Write a protein that binds this ligand. Structure first.
Ligand SMILES: *[C@@H]1O[C@H](CO)[C@@H](O)[C@H](O)[C@H]1NC(C)=O
Lengths: 49, 48, 49, 49, 156, 104, 104, 52
């Protein structure tokens, strides 16, 4: 659940497989140069901290 | 400092207000009675 | 408002109502037909149209 | 705390391209047509949208 | 009416501040400061003249010059020795006649200083400079991607 | 200390790069002047995706529009970290890794 | 002089479901000014400044509701009835439906 | 895998700030900053290469 503890979960610290959804939505570029604008909710771990 | 919110966030019925004429637009209230006159040629005889 | 007419054709129409008891008189071309039915409230209760 | 990777956007220019899913966590993909990349060297390709 | 500047000279002023932190005379008095610009640019009007040669010189226009007055006489100086500060160095943006346009983060005072190689003269004035920006949300700097809105800025 | 044993940064070969100084259009006909002592590739689509290679040479194309043909100074020698401000070579492969120093 | 300048696009909110109401999970990292108003006789103007992230309820007007947030353009969301009114041929507590809508 | 560094080069970046206080290209783009250290130290990852 985005914006709450356990937004990123992994079986082990160095597990190549990870499962997590944090509501990342892209935005259409609207600038002269090349740039990918991303938008996401604040990290859940920081909020729990 | 304390002028408060403008009229765009208080107008009832969602009037969108433009300054240069100072007119409201695209808001709904009331009933309009209208009389429409149609040319006769527009009508089609019931025979066809 | 208008629809094509065949010798013995039948046609479906879409309509909106503000009452659950949808009973009324519908005029097709020059003729009339009275008819009725019962509607149910919807699952989605907030929309912007 | 997590870190959002933003790999260099792929550009298929004066052509057509389609999105492809992957296995990385939270992977989010999106294509955009009519873009017009520019860079310090200038227009990176040549075609009106 | 006209715009020639060779007909006018600088004038000694009285500043509430000086180097020794007490009111005194100086040729760098500032009596006006404008801040209404949305970008943050600040117009400062000083008592000296810069952007022009020594008022009355053979040549009138010279960017590197800075025409001021003292010791019952007017004279020049290298314009690179002029600095502006509110809470830290400001980036000079433009200069013309009496007026100059600069920019620096907010603080509580505006200070303009010049170093004469062996002595320094600075004059300053209280002014409530606070960062402001346009839109329905107060950010820190305009990001790369976003909407375009009308605003008013001081032409450079 | 410079030595580190935490972190893992990727690295892969660079994408293409465009330039304006490689082409000149003072006259109606196109003109390409790749930098002296430097290979260059040029591409444009008028009629077809015509491409050419020039080694300190000024090759020509039938189509005349200035915007038409673009040039790469391709070298693909040094790798580069992925960033939004770059472009990816069509291979899209990871080539190497590096250690992030000064770790906790 | 007047001129065009850029402004940020705040993170778009999430719309939830609430009988004759709405709940917005408002997420922001810097102060953002949100405003809303009904479309009926009573303006019911509301404005607020949001520092971080939270959830806010809004009693959606029966006729309609406006929604302004961030710098992007507003939206209009209206509401209808969803109580179990019509019976199923057997005795039922139909009044409860008419208690949910037009309780008085 | 390796740690050799002569095999890479610096890449131009697009920085929101510049000397003229508007976004522009530059060779000193920053895209990462970490400050979790209790001592207060800060790691900065720039576009250019230094130390070599
Ligand atoms: C360009 O590459 C070709 C292919 O190997 C080579 O023969 C030629 O000498 C190169 N030109 C220059 C100027 O390096």
């Amino acid at each position: 659940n985005p914006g709450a503890f356990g937004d990123i979960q992994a079986s082990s610290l160095d597990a190549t497989d990870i499962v997590a959804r944090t509501d990342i939505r892209l935005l259409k570029p609207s600038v002269k140069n090349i740039h990918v604008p991303y938008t996401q909710a604040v990290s859940g771990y920081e909020m729990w901290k | 400092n304390n002028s408060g919110r403008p009229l765009q966030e208080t107008a009832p019925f969602g009037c969108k207000i433009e300054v240069e004429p100072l007119r409201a637009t695209n808001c709904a209230y009331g009933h309009i009675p209208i009389s429409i006159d149609i040319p006769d040629a527009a009508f089609v005889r019931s025979s066809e | 408002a208008t629809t094509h007419v065949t010798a013995t054709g039948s046609i479906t129409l879409h309509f909106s109502t503000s009452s659950p008891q949808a009973n009324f008189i519908v005029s097709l071309c020059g003729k009339k037909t009275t008819c009725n039915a019962e509607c149910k409230p919807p699952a989605d209760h907030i929309i912007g149209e | 705390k997590f870190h959002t990777v933003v790999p260099s956007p792929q550009v298929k220019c004066c052509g057509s391209l389609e999105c492809k899913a992957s296995s990385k966590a939270d992977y989010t993909c999106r294509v955009f047509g009519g873009v017009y990349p520019f860079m310090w060297g200038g227009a990176q390709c040549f075609c009106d949208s | 009416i006209t715009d020639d500047f060779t007909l006018t000279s600088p004038y000694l002023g009285f500043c509430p501040y000086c180097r020794h932190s007490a009111p005194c005379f100086s040729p760098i008095k500032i009596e006006n400061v404008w801040d209404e610009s949305d970008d943050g640019s600040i117009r400062i009007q000083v008592s000296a003249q810069f952007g022009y040669n020594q008022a009355g010189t053979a040549d009138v226009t010279k960017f590197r010059y800075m025409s001021y007055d003292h010791d019952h006489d007017i004279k020049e100086d290298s314009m690179e020795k002029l600095a502006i500060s509110t809470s830290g160095p400001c980036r000079r943006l433009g200069h013309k006649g009496y007026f100059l346009l600069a920019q620096c983060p907010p603080g509580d005072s505006v200070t303009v200083s010049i170093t004469s190689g062996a002595s320094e003269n600075s004059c300053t004035v209280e002014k409530k400079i606070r960062r402001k920006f346009v839109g329905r949300e107060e950010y820190l700097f305009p990001p790369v991607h976003g909407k375009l809105v009308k605003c008013h800025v001081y032409d450079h | 200390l410079k030595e580190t044993s935490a972190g893992y940064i990727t690295m892969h070969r660079p994408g293409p790069h465009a330039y304006k100084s490689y082409l000149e259009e003072a006259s109606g006909e196109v003109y390409i002047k790749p930098p002296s002592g430097k290979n260059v590739t040029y591409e444009c689509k008028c009629g077809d995706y015509s491409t050419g290679i020039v080694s300190t040479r000024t090759k020509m194309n039938g189509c005349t529009k200035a915007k038409q043909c673009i040039a790469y100074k391709r070298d693909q020698t040094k790798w580069v970290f992925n960033s939004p401000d770059l472009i990816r070579h069509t291979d899209h492969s990871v080539q190497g890794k590096l250690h992030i120093p000064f770790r906790l | 002089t007047p001129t065009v300048c850029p402004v940020p696009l705040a993170h778009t909110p999430t719309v939830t479901k609430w009988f004759k109401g709405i709940t917005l999970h408002l997420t922001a990292t810097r102060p953002t000014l949100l405003t809303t108003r009904k479309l009926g006789l009573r303006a019911d103007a509301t404005a607020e400044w949001i520092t971080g992230t939270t959830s806010r309820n809004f009693s959606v007007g029966r006729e309609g509701l406006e929604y302004v947030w961030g710098n992007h353009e507003p939206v209009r969301v209206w509401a209808q009835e969803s109580a179990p009114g019509d019976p199923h041929g057997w005795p039922h507590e139909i009044i409860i439906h008419y208690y949910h809508r037009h309780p008085v």
